[PDB]
Amino acid sequence: VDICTAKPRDIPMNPMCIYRSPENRRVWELSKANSRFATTFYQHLADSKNDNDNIFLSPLSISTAFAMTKLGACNDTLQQLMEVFKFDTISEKTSDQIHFFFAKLNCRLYRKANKASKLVSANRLFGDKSLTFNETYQDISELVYGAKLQPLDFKENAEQSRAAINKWVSNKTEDVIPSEAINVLVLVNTRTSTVLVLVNTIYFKGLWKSKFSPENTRKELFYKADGESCSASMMYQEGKFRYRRVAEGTQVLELPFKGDDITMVLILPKPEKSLAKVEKELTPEVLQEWLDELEEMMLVVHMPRFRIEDGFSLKEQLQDMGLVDLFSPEKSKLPGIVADLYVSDAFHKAFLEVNEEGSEAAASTAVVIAGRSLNPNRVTFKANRPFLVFIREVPLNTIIFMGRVANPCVK
Ligand SMILES: *[C@@H]1O[C@H](CO)[C@@H](O[C@@H]2O[C@H](CO)[C@@H](O)[C@H](O)[C@H]2NC(C)=O)[C@H](O)[C@H]1NC(C)=O
Ligand SMILES: *[C@@H]1O[C@H](CO)[C@@H](O)[C@H](O)[C@H]1NC(C)=O
Ligand SMILES: *[C@@H]1O[C@H](CO)[C@@H](O)[C@H](O)[C@H]1NC(C)=O
Numbered sequence: 001v002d003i004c005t006a007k008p009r010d011i012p013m014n015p016m017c018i019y020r021s022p023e024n025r026r027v028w029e030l031s032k033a034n035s036r037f038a039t040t041f042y043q044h045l046a047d048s049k050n051d052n053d054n055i056f057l058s059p060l061s062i063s064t065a066f067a068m069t070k071l072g073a074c075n076d077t078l079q080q081l082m083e084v085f086k087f088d089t090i091s092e093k094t095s096d097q098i099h100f101f102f103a104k105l106n107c108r109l110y111r112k113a114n115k116a117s118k119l120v121s122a123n124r125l126f127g128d129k130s131l132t133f134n135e136t137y138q139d140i141s142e143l144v145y146g147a148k149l150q151p152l153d154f155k156e157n158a159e160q161s162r163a164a165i166n167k168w169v170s171n172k173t174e175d176v177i178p179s180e181a182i183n184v185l186v187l188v189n190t191r192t193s194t195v196l197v198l199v200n201t202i203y204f205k206g207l208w209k210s211k212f213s214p215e216n217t218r219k220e221l222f223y224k225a226d227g228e229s230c231s232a233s234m235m236y237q238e239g240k241f242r243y244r245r246v247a248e249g250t251q252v253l254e255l256p257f258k259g260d261d262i263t264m265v266l267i268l269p270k271p272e273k274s275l276a277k278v279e280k281e282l283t284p285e286v287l288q289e290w291l292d293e294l295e296e297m298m299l300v301v302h303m304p305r306f307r308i309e310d311g312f313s314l315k316e317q318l319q320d321m322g323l324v325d326l327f328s329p330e331k332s333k334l335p336g337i338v339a340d341l342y343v344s345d346a347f348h349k350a351f352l353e354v355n356e357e358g359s360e361a362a363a364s365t366a367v368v369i370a371g372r373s374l375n376p377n378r379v380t381f382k383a384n385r386p387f388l389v390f391i392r393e394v395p396l397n398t399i400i401f402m403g404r405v406a407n408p409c410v411k
Contacts, residue, residue, distance in 0.1 A: 003143060004107035008100055014136045015096035016336040017074035021088040029090045030101040031398040034063045036086040036284045038399045044317040046279050051225035054308040056350045056403035058181030058202050065183045065200045067102055068145050071137055072337030077325040084323045103144040108396055116258035117206035122172040123147035126165055126197040128154045134339045154194040165197060172201045179204045179359045181350035188344040190329055195341060204391065206257035208358035212237045213367035217356060222304060222408055223385045230409035232304040235356055238374060242294040249273060252290045253381050257358055261395055267388035275386040298374055302382035306408035309351030352401060
């Protein structure tokens, strides 16, 4: 039974606790949901960080992790999830249906093979070796999120347990891997013993559709939010890119990878406007508006060559966002997982490496453009100051990664 084809009827979905939201078409709406959480969570994460600190994460990964957890959710815990991750914005739907749409979203995201640009997703459950897990939870987790259940000796050998998990992450999350994201959820019982660990991996390998030439790269000044500056490696190139100059100076620019399914969007505000303001103003609706107004346009592209990485606890922000019960040893309601449970820890680790090739291994490459004469009055895009970055799947319109480049300088 292939999920990709299977209809809603074919895949039962024996849901323990069902919840009705207030008042491909579905797959498209889930992406909106997923994107609403993304930008929101980013704003929270941003306010908790310093302006000149880089930010990077994969919100798709996060949504997926907590969607998996939602499988056993019940009562308020269930609702809070549906609300915090905006799953309830798919008007008049139900807990279990969200998982059908995710099965579809995943298919068109990962199963659809044919690269030049590679997007792979790996999910695994690591549950206590000596417990009896609910078979519906098992099956559905496997079916929908392709997550298998591996037993570990959490009780008597937590040390070796951690090793087992890491040996697996390494085999998945860093062939070369220049961009990835890892999400870990620790589920514990009232006794402070690890019952289950949810692990989500997503990583991307993509060659620029219009690659820069290393020969044209040169050390130049990047201007930090602290008013100082440092030496960045500026990549350079001229060409046809989807672009748009929106509200008060802000430049939006799309750089697609080979395949055209996956692209990198940059958001670069004028020198006199702070990235902070833009971040605060970045509502899901505005963002969508910007992506639409994008039109091909010959221009020059000055963009630094960088490697950013990030790591943070999901707990605080998620709580402030409404997700309380799930972390509350007393309130946490996840009955559908074992035949109590609460989330003790939820951390996220990610990094993105970009260069003349794209999200790929640096290479000794050159470029020759022969009979070209471009209007001396063309637009220029010089990212020598902090700018946002998304890596979205266009067809499905989902934000795979996102972050901020506040300092690309390597020193
Ligand atoms: C695992 O949880 C599932 C719900 O996700 C339970 O399945 C239900 O079981 C009850 C009684 O056994 C049936 O009346 C329902 O038809 C089943 N489905 C639903 C959606 O409720 C199941 O009981 C649990 N299994 C174990 C071993 O605890
Ligand atoms: C949770 O939902 C169940 C049935 O879905 C219901 O019986 C119960 O009253 C709700 N609240 C609690 C605290 O169990
Ligand atoms: C992961 O391990 C498998 C063996 O199951 C091996 O075939 C594969 O090459 C490894 N992948 C990476 C990225 O190391």
